[PDB]
Symmetry: D2
Amino acid sequence: PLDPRIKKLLESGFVVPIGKASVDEVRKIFRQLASAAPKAEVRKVEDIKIPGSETSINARVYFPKAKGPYGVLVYLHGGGFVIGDVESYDPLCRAITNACNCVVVSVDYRLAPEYKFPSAVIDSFDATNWIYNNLDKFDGEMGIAIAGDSAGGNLAAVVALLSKGKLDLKYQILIYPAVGFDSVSRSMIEYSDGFFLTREHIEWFGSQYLRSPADLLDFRFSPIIAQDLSGLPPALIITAEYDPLRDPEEAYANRLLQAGVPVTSVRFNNVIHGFLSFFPLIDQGKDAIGLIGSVLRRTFYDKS
Amino acid sequence: PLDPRIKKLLESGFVVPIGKASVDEVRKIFRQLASAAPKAEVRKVEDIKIPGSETSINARVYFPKAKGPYGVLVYLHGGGFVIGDVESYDPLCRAITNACNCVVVSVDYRLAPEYKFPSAVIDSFDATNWIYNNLDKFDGEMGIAIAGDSAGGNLAAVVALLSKGKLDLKYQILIYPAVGFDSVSRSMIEYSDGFFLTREHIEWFGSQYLRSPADLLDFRFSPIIAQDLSGLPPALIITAEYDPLRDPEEAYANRLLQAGVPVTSVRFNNVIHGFLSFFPLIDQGKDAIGLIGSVLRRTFYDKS
Amino acid sequence: PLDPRIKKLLESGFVVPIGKASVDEVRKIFRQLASAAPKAEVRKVEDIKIPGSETSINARVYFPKAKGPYGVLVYLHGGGFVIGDVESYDPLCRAITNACNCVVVSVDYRLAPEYKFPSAVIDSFDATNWIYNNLDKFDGEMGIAIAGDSAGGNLAAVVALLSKGKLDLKYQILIYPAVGFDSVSRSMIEYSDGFFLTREHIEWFGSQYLRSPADLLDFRFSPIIAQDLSGLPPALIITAEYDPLRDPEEAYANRLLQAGVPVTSVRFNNVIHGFLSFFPLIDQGKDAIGLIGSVLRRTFYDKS
Amino acid sequence: PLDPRIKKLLESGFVVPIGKASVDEVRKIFRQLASAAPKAEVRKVEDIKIPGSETSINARVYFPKAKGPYGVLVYLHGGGFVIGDVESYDPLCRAITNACNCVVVSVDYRLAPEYKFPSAVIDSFDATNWIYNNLDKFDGEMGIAIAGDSAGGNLAAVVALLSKGKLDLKYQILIYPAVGFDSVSRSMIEYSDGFFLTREHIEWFGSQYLRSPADLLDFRFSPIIAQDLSGLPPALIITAEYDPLRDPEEAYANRLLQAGVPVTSVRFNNVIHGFLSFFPLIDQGKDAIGLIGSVLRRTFYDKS
């Protein structure tokens, strides 16, 4: 079952009313839930502007207390392509920075409904490309990895596909990613209601971001249908037991492994979608951050 | 685990080499596996020609020994839209006829690759419509129901959708139906190999029947994406534990139930896709036929 | 998920308050829930007294409208070894009689807490033995089979074990049986609350029937630990998707199959423990009765 | 499915022939598989003798390169209560030492069949008690935690129960622990063969360690039946997807959570029982060690 702490939380009015309030109001509610966590100190934080192909892309750079040289983690926030932003994810990014002893660059990709698919993908890819070619500005020569949660994990997976034979990503961290259109899985049907992220929210986010049903078949929305997954960076894929998105994420892990990509696929039992964002209230979220920290310290530094 | 009888069978060379032999050779091998079962006597068998909108449609009519009046079951064979035919399914149709005490009309819908989607759907619908308007010719006034296995179960489900507010179907029997595009489910990933129907076969059948990826999003191929499942006939949905197709079929059951359609969804444990076709070698197949017989005698006759 | 009809029912106060009211009151509430179903006509009903080794055993005999000769189904009711009786199960037994065209003998085995384990087992075995040696009194020469639901299914399975090389049982029908001590399965943990039969009820029933923890290891309470399951009668095992007892029943099916016993193991999706008792309110219960009818008409009569 | 790397490994003759070779030969084969991994440097290693209530208990103490003060992890090796020892687990203990920046004390508890249950429990508890009262000898004032894998994880869980209101354990790390008698779970039935640890091995180990079937009901063998799990130390429970032992471990996690104990329960997908012991050949094993390191650095030091 759910961790009783989580069951109590959901019963006690822990909700974002996606599809039942204006886009402004749902953004505001999410800001308050996410941005409430403590902001751990880091060494230095910098806001920068990345020159993207279609827009100037805001990003926030977090430097760790450890001395360089560093690896650089490009981080793409979640929020169903519609909500979230760099500043609401500041507590989570600072926690990751400290766990990984690495530079984290959190990207403000364009959001729907104002900017439809594939705008978020273009910005996420353009930001990763620029960071790769400018690692020297971050004392970042230990290399680049890409990470994101939920919608951001979808973007991370897709950027890893788009980067093949262009950039040299060390690693992809996919934190309960959306991996594409799912009208069929058991987890999607079983956990459609009552577990924080609902089927109605998933459909509402889709209705804002996608332009037509053809986009469902586009690998830049559904990377699980990509023709060829070989040669992608090694993956850590974190899933949550009581999450409608769980089964397709475990399928994507298996497909990567089948294509010879190294994958550590881990299900956090007893918890729900989005749990890292609520690490003060959901202890397992801290341990998932610690797991991200382990994998990145190993890839970048060959350290424990 | 698999029923040891089935494990022994698969180990002992029980295979159709889909995608690894010519269309002619795979059709021939399937004919031999299916057509090998005993042909139970029925009262009378008749081959008829149904005037379809695009072709003359062959069908075989089986009359039960019980006296009329009858319900009429329209039966659509499986074979991935490419293999099978009325004559290979003659043993299974005779078994159903005897179990249900009903008239069975088995439909020879056009096959791929010669005829692509949606030719099989058009023929299956046209046949059902004609049978409905001609029930009197079968002493068939107790009404019409639709059934099929695998690809035929897909066609049965889709005909039920297309019939809403045109015909009065009493019931839909979906025997491990294909219910649409699935790149994500656990059963599909878990049972992709070694359980008679493989992912490679599913992809090969798709490559023969579909015209483009857009067809994946067509409700006449993927009925699980239909906009509105309400008002469909009550369903019996039979699934098999070790079948890649299992999870999406259980999702379709749940979606029907959510739309207020009565559904009896039953998983036959320990068995594989296609098991009713092999009822002499797989005892559970006999019991699945007996379950079909119960549901149809109740719907048509209000008899035990 | 649950069939919405069932979810509505449970939400609407469908409960037996096991462990929270006196034994008299819980028996009375169960009588009212079970005995409410319509009593289908049969040909003749007779109450008899079977001379058991420890008690005179009441049984109710139901004769079908079909002409003889008959098979005889020994039926053992459920109720956690504590509640239920022949008369509350009269609607279900009449439904089975009509489905199977067979004689049903429903046994009033001694109940806990008045009579502890193994009293129910002794009576169930003694009744089966007497019926076997007296089949001629029922025009019952087509043979004997044993069936029960829940606690009664436990007793049926155990009688099948105790009968090996004494009686010639044709078949065992185990309808969501209790198959022994389970402190570990996923279904038990997952469906411990909210699905009609709860962990607290299971523990309360155990506390009334068992004498000490050693009884947990007795094969006459936990048949899944029996040393040797070979040579038992072919089984139909019915399970329900949302039932804490589900996983150990599927394990018992697998163990039988591994011991070379023919088993048809079927999970009724979307439904709860006890669903056949509520066949007027839960349509799938009718279809499960129809499946029992198919299997028994085949074993006894070699008829469809 | 299994990680293809693991499938290749198992196919390529990766086996301990438990129950099919002498106790000496199975011990020798395990020594060679486990002891083959690289021995990472640590600061200092010491072999000590702990005065137990029934025997002098050998233990190996590993000091980390980081400066003190330290927490102390008591480590209990796996091997089904029969095989393994401190020296075969030296590579894994050194890896843990480095990940946790902590003192690890690996305990040589008495083995079956020479010493039956509960000898291993008595030694594991006596060692933990002595280490707790002698933390000063290890510069170990940051406290004590207990960890073990498989049989050792069973012993760790049981020591945590036995320590309540005697010692102050900070944490219990249970790495695919055996949590007691399981004749019923789906994982046990499903993964009984072909996944390195088999049902036959589990039964053979039991037959060497236990004295009678009554021991199955003893909470010091089956901690999942303990009367009261409240007030135990926070747990990290690691399970593996393709492991017969998986389901009862997830049940034990849930029971702890229900008793208000903090638990992080994580399933490593695609891998088998014992995978941390094979961290050079199974990459996920390294990441599981990194997760142990995160949780211990947090509990002992409040560090990332």
